[PDB]
Amino acid sequence: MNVTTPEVAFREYQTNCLASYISADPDITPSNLILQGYSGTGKTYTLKKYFNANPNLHAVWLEPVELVSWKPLLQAIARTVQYKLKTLYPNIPTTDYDPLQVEEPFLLVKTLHNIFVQYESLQEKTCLFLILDGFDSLQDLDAALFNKYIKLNELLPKDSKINIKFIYTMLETSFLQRYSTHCIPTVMFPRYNVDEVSTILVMSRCGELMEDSCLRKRIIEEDDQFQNVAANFIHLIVQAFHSYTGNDIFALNDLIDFKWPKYVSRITKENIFEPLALYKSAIKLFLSTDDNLDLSIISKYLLIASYICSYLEPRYDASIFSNPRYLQPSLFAIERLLAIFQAIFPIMKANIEVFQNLSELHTLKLIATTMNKNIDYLSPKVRWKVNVPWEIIKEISESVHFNISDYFS
Amino acid sequence: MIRLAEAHAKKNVVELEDVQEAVRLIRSAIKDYATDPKVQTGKSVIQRKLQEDLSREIMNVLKMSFNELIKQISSDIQEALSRLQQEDKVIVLGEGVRRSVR
Amino acid sequence: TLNSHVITFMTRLSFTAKLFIYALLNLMKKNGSQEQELGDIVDEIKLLIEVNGSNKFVMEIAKTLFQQGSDNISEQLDFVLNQLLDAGILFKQTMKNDRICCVKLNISVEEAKRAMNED
Amino acid sequence: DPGFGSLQRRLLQQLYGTLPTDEKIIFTYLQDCQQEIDRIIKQSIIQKESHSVILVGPRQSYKTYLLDYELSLLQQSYKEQFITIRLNGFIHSEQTAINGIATQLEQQLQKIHTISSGSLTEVFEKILLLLDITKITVVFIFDEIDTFAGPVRQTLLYNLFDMVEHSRVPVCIFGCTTKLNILEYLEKRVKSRFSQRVIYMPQIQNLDDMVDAVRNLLTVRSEISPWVSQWNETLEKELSDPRSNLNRHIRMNFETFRSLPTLKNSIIPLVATSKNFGSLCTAIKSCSFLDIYNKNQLSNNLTGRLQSLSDLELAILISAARVALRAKDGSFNFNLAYAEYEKMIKAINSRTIKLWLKKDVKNVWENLVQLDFFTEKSAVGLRDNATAAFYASNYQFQGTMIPFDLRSYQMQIILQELRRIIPKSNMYYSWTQL
Ligand SMILES: Nc1ncnc2c1ncn2[C@@H]1O[C@H](COP(=O)(O)OP(=O)(O)OP(=O)(O)O)[C@@H](O)[C@H]1O
Numbered sequence A: 001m002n003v004t005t006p007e008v009a010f011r012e013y014q015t016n017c018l019a020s021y022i023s024a025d026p027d028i029t030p031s032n033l034i035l036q037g038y039s040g041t042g043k044t045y046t047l048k049k050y051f052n053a054n055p056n057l058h059a060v061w062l063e064p065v066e067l068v069s070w071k072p073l074l075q076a077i078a079r080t081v082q083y084k085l086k087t088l089y090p091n092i093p094t095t096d097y098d099p100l101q102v103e104e105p106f107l108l109v110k111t112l113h114n115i116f117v118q119y120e121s122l123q124e125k126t127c128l129f130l131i132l133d134g135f136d137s138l139q140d141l142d143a144a145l146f147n148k149y150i151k152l153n154e155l156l157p158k159d160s161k162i163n164i165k166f167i168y169t170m171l172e173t174s175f176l177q178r179y180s181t182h183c184i185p186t187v188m189f190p191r192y193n194v195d196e197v198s199t200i201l202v203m204s205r206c207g208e209l210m211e212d213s214c215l216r217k218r219i220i221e222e223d224d225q226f227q228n229v230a231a232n233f234i235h236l237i238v239q240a241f242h243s244y245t246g247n248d249i250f251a252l253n254d255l256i257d258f259k260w261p262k263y264v265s266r267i268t269k270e271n272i273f274e275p276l277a278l279y280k281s282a283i284k285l286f287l288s289t290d291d292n293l294d295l296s297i298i299s300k301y302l303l304i305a306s307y308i309c310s311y312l313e314p315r316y317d318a319s320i321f322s323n324p325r326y327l328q329p330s331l332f333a334i335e336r337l338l339a340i341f342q343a344i345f346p347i348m349k350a351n352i353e354v355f356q357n358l359s360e361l362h363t364l365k366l367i368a369t370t371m372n373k374n375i376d377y378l379s380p381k382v383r384w385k386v387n388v389p390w391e392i393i394k395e396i397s398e399s400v401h402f403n404i405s406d407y408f409s
Numbered sequence B: 001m002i003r004l005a006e007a008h009a010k011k012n013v014v015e016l017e018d019v020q021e022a023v024r025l026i027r028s029a030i031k032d033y034a035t036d037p038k039v040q041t042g043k044s045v046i047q048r049k050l051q052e053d054l055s056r057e058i059m060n061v062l063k064m065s066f067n068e069l070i071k072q073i074s075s076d077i078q079e080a081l082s083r084l085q086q087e088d089k090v091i092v093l094g095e096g097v098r099r100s101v102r
Numbered sequence C: 001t002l003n004s005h006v007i008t009f010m011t012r013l014s015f016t017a018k019l020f021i022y023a024l025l026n027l028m029k030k031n032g033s034q035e036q037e038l039g040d041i042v043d044e045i046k047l048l049i050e051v052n053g054s055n056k057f058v059m060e061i062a063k064t065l066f067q068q069g070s071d072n073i074s075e076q077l078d079f080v081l082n083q084l085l086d087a088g089i090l091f092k093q094t095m096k097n098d099r100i101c102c103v104k105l106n107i108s109v110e111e112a113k114r115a116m117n118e119d
Numbered sequence D: 001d002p003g004f005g006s007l008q009r010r011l012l013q014q015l016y017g018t019l020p021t022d023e024k025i026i027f028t029y030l031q032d033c034q035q036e037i038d039r040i041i042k043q044s045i046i047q048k049e050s051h052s053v054i055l056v057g058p059r060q061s062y063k064t065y066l067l068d069y070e071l072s073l074l075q076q077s078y079k080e081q082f083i084t085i086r087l088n089g090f091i092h093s094e095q096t097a098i099n100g101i102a103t104q105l106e107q108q109l110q111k112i113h114t115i116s117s118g119s120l121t122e123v124f125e126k127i128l129l130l131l132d133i134t135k136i137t138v139v140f141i142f143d144e145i146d147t148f149a150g151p152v153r154q155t156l157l158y159n160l161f162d163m164v165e166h167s168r169v170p171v172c173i174f175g176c177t178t179k180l181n182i183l184e185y186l187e188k189r190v191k192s193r194f195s196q197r198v199i200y201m202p203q204i205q206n207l208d209d210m211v212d213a214v215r216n217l218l219t220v221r222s223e224i225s226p227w228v229s230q231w232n233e234t235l236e237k238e239l240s241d242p243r244s245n246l247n248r249h250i251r252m253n254f255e256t257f258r259s260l261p262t263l264k265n266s267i268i269p270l271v272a273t274s275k276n277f278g279s280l281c282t283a284i285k286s287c288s289f290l291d292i293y294n295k296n297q298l299s300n301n302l303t304g305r306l307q308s309l310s311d312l313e314l315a316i317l318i319s320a321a322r323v324a325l326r327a328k329d330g331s332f333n334f335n336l337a338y339a340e341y342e343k344m345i346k347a348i349n350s351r352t353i354k355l356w357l358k359k360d361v362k363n364v365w366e367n368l369v370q371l372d373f374f375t376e377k378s379a380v381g382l383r384d385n386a387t388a389a390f391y392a393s394n395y396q397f398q399g400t401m402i403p404f405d406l407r408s409y410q411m412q413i414i415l416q417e418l419r420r421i422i423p424k425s426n427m428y429y430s431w432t433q434l
């Protein structure tokens, strides 16, 4: 095994496991290799640096998440393999095949067999790594999809100069346990802790924060000094959002960019050397997450009567007008809704104006029914139900000065 | 358990043998149940694991008395020794000490 | 041809595969519903381990089934589950949960108890 | 070092199985199984006798490995007397199985010295006119035959078995399946044409069968490196002593996995990670790398995912577990989980934990769902085949129309299991007893 093992931060065991399987010799290279790991574990970072230091390995990258269905997945395999083998050996005259002719799992074996037959003029055996970054991220996923890819090397001819290599990068855990009896060398990726997450964000965001346009324009209006300033903001963001984000890299990277311009403008000629006064001046950037960044009168009263008919039994309605809110609402009828709506309305018959506001209440997805697509409002079997939470229905009744909390007390 | 162990020796002191007898009386009614109220050879091993556990200490000596085997590792102890004697694995050589197979 | 290889198949399995069959048959003699969930088999396996935890003869297997003989490995809560499914012995419904998923037996109940007593 | 590079490559080629036919490794417990398979192959290619045998065995039970060795042994002497026709049950469907036979026949006949031309009806017509000085043995290798034994109709299984008794051309069908009761999966007429030749694959019985298999996979029987004589003495010393570290990992895998390809997944990276001969003998004696591989395999499960959580991620899962435990069916939503978490913060501070608002727990609630912890109530999830996966995508479920605070979820771990995987040093241990 002649290969170069790169140095990855907090990935000493993961980098050594990739060098023991991925090699330039197919005799010591497995046909299957699963890289299981959740988001924010560094699966793509440990794979790009491993293939960049070694230029003798030919790997083909493929994103199954950009193909939705499984039909374009079979077409993208034969299209990327022929394109990669064309630029690898331009001194070999091969025949171009149509990648759109792969519509069945059997057709993929015939297409790959028609390409490897014209590449037998080589000397040694050259591997062909087909990295499938995100196999379980495919839309139309089933339990029989992975069984058709783990047996692809069996149908391929053994006396071939180019052998395919499948590499899967799973995300969840239950999807991997469904094929544990196949004995596949899986390389797991555990999530980082509070000491490895902050160290990764420091060595990845310091090169873009100190050279930003906002920080360079603040020092002229009011390189070792700017490094400690950008490193202090990264450490203060993680320690203040460790419970809101957890251990995700994408959740913490968005909060840094959202608070970087607001933290640079709060730096003056005295807050550059005193980090104690800088944290007190911008206390509104660490105490909260800063979030993320006209109804009609008849329409307001219709949502109030719909909330009662969906969270109360209709057998006791002749004693009031004459916690159930924690569960799913119940379905009612059209005539049952107009009876309570007319009673709670202040000093009105059911004209076309009442039905007009009721039809618009369903367009905004404020009230659910029994059918989603192609609904029949004139059908007597289709019932209606509420579709708004308790917090939304509370602010609506408060604007019209209506006591909505006394009906459920 | 305090009054049960004190009445067993009623001896001016409470020995270790009197405390072990009180636990057996309490465990006789509060057992065989946990999250729900209301054979051991193959399903619950024991006999399959003791054959490789007691013989491991005997093989390490040749590389013993009946009292030394208990301290180094008692109804199940004597039952495992009779099983190996039928398969020509150990030698009795009296009740004092035990001898392994040649 | 007239012989049945299902009886001799369970007698040559490992301790983890034999414990899953013995735990499933014990749950059928308590409720009698022929439909034990996956969460009940896990609780029944741990219940049989803590029967004689104070004895040194039983604790020797607890360090392997839950820690594999390593102090860095935490106490665990898939290989023997999918093995019996492809052999036509055990069944499993299509469910995304790993606690309320019912587990049914495909083979007979009389021939399954004979393999547990042979061990 | 040139001496260690030749020994490291040879040891890795033995575990993967890429050795030539003249130097293949045959185990002791599998020696009585390959002899019956070799008898059927030698009788159909040399003696030209039609046979039909369907192999039955568990996953990774050395089924395809034994069939590949028999085809390579016969190709070194009788390479112009038979062909190789391989079939799969997962890749090839019902309609694609007809075109797969004609495709593999036109490529094998041109190699010894059209069929797959036209529509689907004309392809199957030319196959029956061909199969139904000596002849040519058409060796059929069928993988996952349980998928083709459908209780609705077995068209391919009826035509394949007809090419053995009535047909004069020697056709050797070697089916490989995993179902133990493969005789009941066939029809009344399909089972009549079968010879009832079901060869069951043997398994590991005693403990000495696994020791001889590992020793035969790490012993270099060729003079290709100066460190061969020194490596055989180190491997034989650790295996003969039951108190060593190599015998402990074999006995542990014998009672937990009892699989040879499963245990081979850890020996391959142990040898490749060694820099020289001194590092190889050290890792093979203390087995320090084997303990690291076992911890990584159980690091992304339900136990390893709890240690990678913060203080808020653990408080939400604990508060949500108490709601489903006290309920009848275990149904809960975001509104029921927030009520238990809010009552726990005010109870601890009364005897300072920052109480997060309801707008901040939404990000934590969605992060626990992706981490496999909160499953939807009465949800199928991943479908079996591709037929049920398409019908489920076109139908809009009721959980997508209702808001997130009213979605019924289920706990993947009860409160009884959370108290065992949480140490006493944590402050959230007092709210896990109920
Ligand atoms: N050990 C590390 N040291 C430095 N940077 C790292 C490390 N691990 C991950 N990163 C950084 O994390 C960033 C985002 O992670 P990335 O999306 O590559 O991870 P992943 O686990 O492959 O993702 P996904 O689950 O979405 O496929 C990368 O751009 C990379 O630079």
Ligand SMILES: Nc1ncnc2c1ncn2[C@@H]1O[C@H](COP(=O)(O)OP(=O)(O)OP(=O)(O)O)[C@@H](O)[C@H]1O
Pocket: A182, A183, D016, D017, D018, D058, D059, D060, D061, D062, D063, D064, D065, D066, D068, D176, D261
């Ligand atoms: N042509 C081959 N060369 C080398 N090793 C092989 C070959 N075919 C199979 N093997 C080995 O056989 C081992 C056991 O799997 P095998 O394919 O023999 O079983 P199977 O029951 O037919 O497969 P599966 O259960 O995945 O359907 C694997 O670990 C693999 O390394």
Ligand SMILES: [Mg+2]
Pocket: A043, A044, A133
């Ligand atoms: Mg990625």
Ligand SMILES: [Mg+2]
Pocket: D063, D064, D143, D176
């Ligand atoms: Mg196979």
